[PDB]
Amino acid sequence: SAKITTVIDIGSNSVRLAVFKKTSQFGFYLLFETKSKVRISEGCYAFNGILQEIPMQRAVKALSEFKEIALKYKSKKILCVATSAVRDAPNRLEFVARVKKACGLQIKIIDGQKEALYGGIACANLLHKNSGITIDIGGGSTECALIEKGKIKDLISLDVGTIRIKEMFLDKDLDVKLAKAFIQKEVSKLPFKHKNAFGVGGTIRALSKVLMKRFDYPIDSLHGYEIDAHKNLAFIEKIVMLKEDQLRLLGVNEERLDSIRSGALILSVVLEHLKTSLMITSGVGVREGVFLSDLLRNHYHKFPPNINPSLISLKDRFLPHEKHSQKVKKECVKLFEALSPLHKIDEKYLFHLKIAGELASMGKILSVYLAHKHSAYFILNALSYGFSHQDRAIICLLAQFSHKKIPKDNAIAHMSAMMPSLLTLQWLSFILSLAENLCLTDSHHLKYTLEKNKLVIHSNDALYLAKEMLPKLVKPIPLTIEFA
Amino acid sequence: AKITTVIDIGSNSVRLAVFKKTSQFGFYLLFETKSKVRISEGCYAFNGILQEIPMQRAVKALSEFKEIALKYKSKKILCVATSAVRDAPNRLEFVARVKKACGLQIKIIDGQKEALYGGIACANLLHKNSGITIDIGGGSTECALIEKGKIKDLISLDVGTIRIKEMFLVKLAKAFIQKEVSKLPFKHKNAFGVGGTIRALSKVLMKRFDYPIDSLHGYEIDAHKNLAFIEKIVMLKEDQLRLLGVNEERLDSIRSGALILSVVLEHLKTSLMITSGVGVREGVFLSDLLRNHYHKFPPNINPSLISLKDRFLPHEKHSQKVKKECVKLFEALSPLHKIDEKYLFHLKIAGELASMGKILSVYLAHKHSAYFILNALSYGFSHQDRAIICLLAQFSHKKIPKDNAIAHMSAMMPSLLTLQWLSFILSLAENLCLTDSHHLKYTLEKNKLVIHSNDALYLAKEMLPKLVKPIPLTIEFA
């Protein structure tokens, strides 16, 4: 296993490259990513899958430069897989040899089961829910993996894809009704159902962006975006029939216009069949699954319990000294417990409080001025694997507003109907703030009790600075705070 | 040391700064805190002898400051004391008491030394290096004359906000101050405002002008235009000051501070005051850092630019390539854009820093790079220069909006068209540097730019349509 690993995926629509960098045993992050839409499948579907010359030439040229990029980052391992368009191709051996000849890259053609597995491995490890069904919609095929509690159960690969449907129906000028009936037949082959889906791939990313723009969503990242599938199913169905200009007005990018409608059609049929309630947009897929297969060597390729690669790598990069963050987290927990009779907050939020406690001072790596704002910025933007947007929102807010009143008008606080109340957020940010004050100095054996409305801080230390600072805390409710 | 803590003991408060040195010249301020222990409380009536309860407060605070220094693993701890302690007949008692409690060894410095440290900071860390520092404290006021980063002269005035609040709180107080201020031997068009009292006054002026940038450091004030309002602040009742945004702790000193400042500015004949976020603590640190360099960074050495790269850009090969192509493209396209070469400064640095944000996330990396620049490129850069560099990065491969706040932060800012040109040039340079390309050369023929290469540059060609052009222009690959 290597410190710098490049994974290249040759799909039916585009070729894509990811460079992953190890920061610790389980910590890693995505160092670089790029894609080229070479559409190697262009014109092949009428030819019984034979890859056409011009598309093959485009693919070779892109892949040669992907090799250059891999070497630029000094990758010690370079892994290359090819999916539906290449595996289906009668001339696949010719194409593989041409790439090896030009680029030195050895393509591993993977079957649909393996493709579904790699997607499943990524989603089972890197999302904020571990039970659900992946939906990976590509140009030539669509894969679903059923995951139960982090374990891959079943796999299905279907030959329906955005470009396949485009070229066999929407080009030959067969009605949308015909395309739909054909997709429905293939989708009937999926035996399972689940409330959760993990959306994988470019079609689903593009459609996610459409919904974010349509609804004025406050958060920029794609990974961990939660879509109400029922609520949005009709609109996804409507996209199928839109003109390209209507797609442009929804913010669809120029290169996405020609495949997004067949993609929406496949997605709508699949969601309906799986009986999906929640779709999580996944920024991860086959490339991550290939990397995780190489990173984690044990039978199922799973992270050990309570190991999060994104939280770990964030600390590796920006917080290599862990003592202070740990102590603040510990006092946050003790304070939350002592104050629980007053606040009555659901213990599920201890998850968010603990991580805010660890990361609140991360932003000092940038500047002392507005350090908490910077931590929040880092949290919202860089804490990805294993966290929902809602998770990041709560954590970001606790840090950002430390020693401050949270405004009634904050957009992130309102990002969903399921967000905690302002009062809950203020409680949690207050607890973090007081923990920070108490942990400023070298202070051991802190203990907290609640006597009536009164929080009592027990310490053997003088705590001079913490006493001085007490009036600058913003309390969620009037609360008497005393030092024994 | 890698981590150095500097503690300074003033009349009103004790302050701590922890500095992290990332390379030979790179460093940044890691942590800071203050405690207003008012060690000088009631000491004037007593012949300047520091009273028991105030000394007890100082010792408790300093003890915990020591703990903080150790929690940051500081390998060097430097502690200086200024006018209140300096002037105290029991200063030896106090120094011994502090050493007994936490082990801290206090170095009492005189007024000239205090002026020197403030001067070293302002000489190195601001975007102009010629001028006169003004450091207004509770017990004294220091001024250092700096010429091109070198310190020419030093003086410590026996006037501070405490005594002026005591004796007077305008024609009278001003009369007393003037007596001391007349002792200033020098004048300059530039002043560097130092200290929390002047920073508080600067916040008031920044809030009232609606300033798009947050940093106090490097904030420029027109000394003539704002003198009236500075003098006004002196006569304001506490209630009004509170409305102007003045923090609770600074209400006692901000009026007498405003009075001293107005007298000094008039005497120095200052036309421009640059608010400094640095002072004695940074000066003590730099005295050590620069001891072998004559207390000045060598030419083209900027500690913030360097420390930014130390933190976020460990490998510079790619960014030096982008910079180099930025310059070559600028010079090839100059007949068309006709842009002032002074902006090559900003373009080169945006070229160096554009991919910095990738360390945070590859998604929206340019937005992160911009965020880093705006917030962390601080020492030695003017607000305008920083804003330009931020914009070029932020808007790579995009159209810059007409209403942009940062772009409009002043009338000396470049035009939207100039900004779009520079952002476009950066964007094209980034495209050409994606792969492992060999020597590139550019030519211009009317509105046609020609890229000459022995490389296929397949990806760069594919990406071409995603570039946002400032004018109609033809880009071809030879």
Do the Cβ atoms of A465 and B215 come within 8 Å? no
Amino acid at B275: T
Which pair of tokens denotes residue B246? Answer: 């003045």
From A471, which residue of chain B is nearest by alpha-carbon distance? B248
Helix, strand or coil, per DSSP, at residue A477: coil
Q: Closest to B435 (Cβ–Cβ): which among A68, A442, A468?
A: A68
User: Residue A246 contacts by C-beta under 8 Å, 6 or more apart in sequence?
Assistant: none
Helix, strand or coil, per DSSP, at residue A357: helix
The full DSSP string for A269-335 is HHHHHHT-SEEEE-S--HHHHHHHHHH--SSS--PPTT--HHHHHHHHHH----HHHHHHHHHHHHH
Strand pairing partners for A77?
Answer: A5
Helix, strand or coil, per DSSP, at residue A31: strand
Helix, strand or coil, per DSSP, at residue A7: strand
* 3-state secondary structure labels for all residues of chain B: CCEEEEEEECCCCEEEEEEEECCCCCEEEEEEEEECCCCCCCCCCCCCCCCHHHHHHHHHHHHHHHHHHHHCCCCEEEEEECHHHHCCCCHHHHHHHHHHHHCCCEEECCHHHHHHHHHHHHHHHCCCCCEEEEEECCCCEEEEEEECCEEEEEEEECCCHHHHHHHCCCHHHHHHHHHHHCCCCCCCCEEEEECHHHHHHHHHHHHHCCCCCCCCCCCEEEHHHHHHHHHHHCCCCHHHHHHCCCCHHHHHHHHHHHHHHHHHHHHHCCCEEEECCCCHHHHHHHHHHCCCCCCCCCCCCCHHHHHHHHHHCCCCHHHHHHHHHHHHHHHHHHHHHCCCHHHHHHHHHHHHHCCHHHHCCCCCHHHHHHHHHHHHCCCCCCHHHHHHHHHHHHCCCCCCCCCCCCCCCCCCCCCHHHHHHHHHHHHHHHHHCCCCCCCCEEEEECCEEEEECCCCCHHHHHHHHHCCCCCCCEEEEC
Strands across the sheet with A278-281, in order? Answer: A151-158, A142-148, A132-137, A196-200, A278-281, A225-228
Interface test with A, best of B304, B315, B362 (most A CBs within 10 A): B362
Q: Which of A203, A320, A13, A70 is nearest to B434 (CA)?
A: A70
Strand pairing partners for A200?
Answer: A136
The angstrom resolution of this structure is 1.7
Does A200 appear as a known binding residue? no
Contact A55, A139 (CB under 8 A): no
CA distances from A371 to A361, A400, A441, B29, B193 (A): 7, 9, 18, 11, 24
Q: Which of A409, A413, A415, A328 is nearest to A364 (CA)?
A: A328
The full DSSP string for A113-152 is HHHHHHHHHHHHHHSS--SEEEEEE-SS-EEEEEEETTEE
Q: Which of B48, B154, B62 is nearest to B100 (CA)?
A: B62
Do the Cβ atoms of A368 and B32 come within 8 Å? yes
Do the Cβ atoms of A367 and B378 come within 8 Å? yes
From B309, which residue of chain A is nearest by alpha-carbon distance? A366
CA distances from B418 to B245, B329, B341, B391, B442 (A): 37, 14, 11, 11, 20
Do the Cβ atoms of A464 and B35 come within 8 Å? yes
Backbone break loci in chain B, preceding residues, C–N > 2.5 A: 169
Q: Which element (helix H / strand E) includes A19?
A: strand A15-22
- The string over B172-189, giving b where at least 16 C-beta atoms fall within 10 Å of a residue's C-beta and e elsewhere, is ebbebbeebbeebeeebe
Separation in Å, CA of A368 to nearest CA in chain B: 6
CA atoms within 13 A on the CB side of B279: 27
What is d(CA A7, CA A20) in angstroms, rounded to the nearest whole number?
Answer: 8
Helix, strand or coil, per DSSP, at residue A380: helix
Angle subtended by helix axes A389-400 and A350-359, to nearest 10: 60
What is d(CA B157, CA B182) in angstroms, rounded to the nearest whole number?
Answer: 10
DSSP code for A420: P
Do the Cβ atoms of A442 and B70 come within 8 Å? yes
What is d(CA B231, CA B262) in angstroms, rounded to the nearest whole number?
Answer: 6
DSSP code for A5: E
Q: Closest to A33 (Cβ–Cβ): which among B64, B362, B375?
A: B362
From A439, which residue of chain B is nearest by alpha-carbon distance? B68
Q: Which of B328, B369, B374 is nearest to B352 (CA)?
A: B369
Do the Cβ atoms of A62 and B33 come within 8 Å? no
Which pair of tokens denotes residue B389? Answer: 């560099």
Contact A66, A84 (CB under 8 A): no
Do the Cβ atoms of A462 and B30 come within 8 Å? no
Residues of B in contact with A310 (CB under 8 A): none
Residues of B in contact with A381 (CB under 8 A): 360-361, 363-364, 368
What is d(CA B80, CA B105) in angstroms, rounded to the nearest whole number?
Answer: 9
Q: Which element (helix H / strand E) includes A266?
A: helix A260-274
Beta-carbon pairs below 8 A across chains A and B: 101
Do the Cβ atoms of A64 and B456 come within 8 Å? yes
Does B242 appear as a known binding residue? no
CA distances from A431 to A296, A338, B182, B211 (A): 37, 11, 53, 33
Tell how strand A480-483 and strand A454-458 pair up: parallel
Does A368 appear as a known binding residue? yes
Alpha helices in A360-483 (DSSP H): 371-382, 389-400, 422-438, 464-469
Which pair of tokens denotes residue A125? Answer: 């490890």
C-alpha torsion sign, points B416, B419, B424, B427: negative
Tell how strand B190-194 and strand B141-147 pair up: unpaired
What is d(CA A24, CA A245) in angstroms, rounded to the nearest whole number?
Answer: 47
From A222, which residue of chain B is nearest by alpha-carbon distance? B363
Residue with tokens 């850069």: B381
Do the Cβ atoms of B33 and A364 come within 8 Å? no
> How many CB atoms neighbour CB B462 within 10 A?
19
Which pair of tokens denotes residue A381? Answer: 């933007």
Contact B106, B81 (CB under 8 A): yes
From A72, which residue of chain B is nearest by alpha-carbon distance? B436
What is d(CA B475, CA B428) in angstroms, rounded to the nearest whole number?
Answer: 10
Q: Which element (helix H / strand E) includes A481?
A: strand A480-483
Q: How was this structure determined?
A: X-ray
Residues of A in contact with B29 (CB under 8 A): 367-368
Q: Closest to B371 (Cβ–Cβ): which among A32, A377, A384?
A: A377
> How many CB atoms neighbour CB A1 within 10 A?
11
